[PDB]
Structure 1
Amino acid sequence: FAADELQQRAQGLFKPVPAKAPTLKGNPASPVKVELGKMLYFDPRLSASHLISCNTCHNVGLGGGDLQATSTGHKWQQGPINAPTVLNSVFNTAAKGPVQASVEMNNTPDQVVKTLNSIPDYVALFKKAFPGEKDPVTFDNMAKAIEVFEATLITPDSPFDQYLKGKKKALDGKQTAGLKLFLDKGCVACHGGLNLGGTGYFPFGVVEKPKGRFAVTNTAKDEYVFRAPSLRNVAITYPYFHSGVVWSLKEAVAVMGSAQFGIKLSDDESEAIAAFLGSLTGKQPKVVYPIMPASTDATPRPRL
């Protein structure tokens, strides 16, 4: 069939989001370290101001992102960039890492550890989640708990996963079309894999110009690479591109049939393709809001 072959094909070029959180190297999972990681992820006491947590910009009930064109949350950033989703971030390859870069932006490791040492409940959770350690309340221990909570922030069973799994009836007519167009148009070169993307860097980026106020450019000439985003849950993580300038997901497909790629796109193939991309929305994780423990007289105060 022309099917059993879009489908035996895709089965090859993509893997589904696994049932369970993956293993992190150096950093075993446990109910307690996951509880701890989640407490921290939601605690705005990690910012010097007591105003920002990771959820502020990576909102688990609104697709893992912040709905904003751009923001600055990591110290390595040369200015506002669009916040990627935390959802399925663990599968990407995109004190060097996300928690540390965040903390050193809004705080110093020092005040963060003074803050955690200051609350008995947190000390006690650090001791359960990292046992047999003399001093388990460390900057590095804290990032590791958060990472193990992040690892649970995956979205199994989108219509597409249910398709690579077997079921052809998981995609509809217009999304099965869309797919073929996605492969056929080479889409899957740059945005394929376990995570449809999150994996390569390309001398390719969306730009203003000083039907298509926006389009692609070659930045080889500037030794500038951008990573090619995971496309999972993209229907829920607008606006689009590093600068968050495209709001319509149809547009964003129309900006990505660039000359620069050897790809032409019809207004109706973009359509088909946006409707394929809709299929990439998985089951949103179920998070019980953490009950974070009260500060004590010893806890540093908001700083200004």
Structure 2
Amino acid sequence: DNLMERANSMFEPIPKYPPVIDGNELTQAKVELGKMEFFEPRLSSSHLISCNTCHNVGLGGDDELPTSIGHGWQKGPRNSPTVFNAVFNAAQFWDGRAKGPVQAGVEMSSTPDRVVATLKSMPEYIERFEDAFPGQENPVTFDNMAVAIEAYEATLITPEAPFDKYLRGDTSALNESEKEGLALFMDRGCTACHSGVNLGGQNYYPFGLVAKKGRFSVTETASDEYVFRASPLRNIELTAPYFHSGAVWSLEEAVAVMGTAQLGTELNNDEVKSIVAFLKTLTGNVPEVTYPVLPPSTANTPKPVDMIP
């Protein structure tokens, strides 16, 4: 199969087991702590927002809103991307600009000092930090908190999508209609920006969605100065709405506004549908999640702050 070897030169399948990213070892104590952290709403000053609020594991790893809640409980500027397979993305933000997603996420509703004070006020967290970061005198630090969360994110991968079975050899994993969408995807230029393990998530490009249904289009930015990350398309079927602003709900419309003659990627209606069929084959196994049990607050725990004072 030439189609198959072509696909294997452009893409890679999601690893079957959680990866060690940047030397972040997956010990049980660290992954368990990270899981607690991920669902811990007390990392926010209101005690109501956790990573799971915006990267909902039951909703595709994101929040299914055009844009996430920003300051107060007002509309934020960006669509929250899925946390599923995110550890494989070299480009982590929508806009080309040194904080990482974890830090940016927490700071959206709180401060490092307050987060640390919160975690040290609960005996169980101190014990877990001590067990997850053995031999450190002050294990509960904002950096270690991030390392633990990151270790947990490494387990939030979605292996075994039909397409990955195909890449691994099962010529039958994709049907006729899906092989066309795949051929189109590799023939009409999509792979110039959306390739690798997540079919995207690696580079910024000078193209963004703008108001032009057919109310939007992706157009080159002035002088190519501002750039947007070409989104990782893996699990795209489950991460609507689309684009940096979440302005497009239809996956079909999303593919349409990216496949124009004026991009070097022209697609007619049927060709759009074929790509959509191929994109659906990118949905992998949602990782199983056992809800953690968080420890109760103590007298030293900073009190919740009202969102709307």
Helix, strand or coil for the counterpart of 2:166? Answer: helix
Partner of 2:259: 257
| TM-score calculated relative to the size of structure 1 | 0.95
| Aligned AA (1:286) | E
Partner of 1:280: 282
Q: Decide whether aligned partners of structure 1 residues 73 and 166 sit closer, same or farther in structure 2, where only a CA change above 3 A counts.
A: farther
Equivalent residues of 1:216, 1:258 under 8 A apart: no
Task: Within 5 Å, give how 1:1-304 maps onto structure 2.
Answer: 4-72=1-69, 80-94=77-91, 96-209=99-212, 212-221=214-223, 223-304=225-306
Q: 1:105: Cα distance to partner?
A: 2.0
* Distance in 2 (alpha carbons) for counterparts of 1:129 and 1:300: 24
* Distance in 1 (alpha carbons) for counterparts of 2:112 and 2:40: 15
| Aligned AA (2:181) | G
Equivalent residues of 2:67, 2:76 under 8 A apart: no
Between 1:168-177 and 1:277-286, the stretch displaced more is 168-177
Q: Which runs of 5+ in 2 are unaligned?
A: 92-97
Q: 1:301: Cα distance to partner?
A: 1.0
Q: Which runs of 5+ in 1 are unaligned?
A: none
Between 1:132-141 and 1:90-99, the stretch displaced more is 90-99
RMSD (Å), alpha carbons: 1.5
| Aligned AA (1:132) | G
* Distance in 1 (alpha carbons) for counterparts of 2:111 and 2:117: 10
* Distance in 2 (alpha carbons) for counterparts of 1:237 and 1:229: 11
* Distance in 2 (alpha carbons) for counterparts of 1:237 and 1:194: 17
Q: 1:93: Cα distance to partner?
A: 1.1
* Distance in 2 (alpha carbons) for counterparts of 1:276 and 1:130: 43
* Distance in 2 (alpha carbons) for counterparts of 1:177 and 1:23: 35
* Distance in 2 (alpha carbons) for counterparts of 1:27 and 1:8: 32
Equivalent residues of 1:240, 1:249 under 8 A apart: yes
Number of residue pairs aligned between Structure 1 and Structure 2: 297
Q: Decide whether aligned partners of structure 1 residues 176 and 226 sit closer, same or farther in structure 2, where only a CA change above 3 A counts.
A: same
* Distance in 1 (alpha carbons) for counterparts of 2:261 and 2:215: 15
Helix, strand or coil for the counterpart of 1:207? Answer: strand
> What per-residue deviation string (whole Å, max 9, x for no partner) do you get for residues 262-299 of structure 1?
12211010001000000000000001001111111111
| Aligned AA (1:142) | M
| TM-score calculated relative to the size of structure 2 | 0.93
Helix, strand or coil for the counterpart of 2:190? Answer: coil
Identity of matched residues, %:
62
Q: Decide whether aligned partners of structure 1 residues 303 and 127 sit closer, same or farther in structure 2, where only a CA change above 3 A counts.
A: same
* Distance in 1 (alpha carbons) for counterparts of 2:252 and 2:107: 37
Q: Which stretches of structure 1, 4 residues or longer, exceed 6 Å deviation after superposition? A: none
Equivalent residues of 1:175, 1:275 under 8 A apart: yes
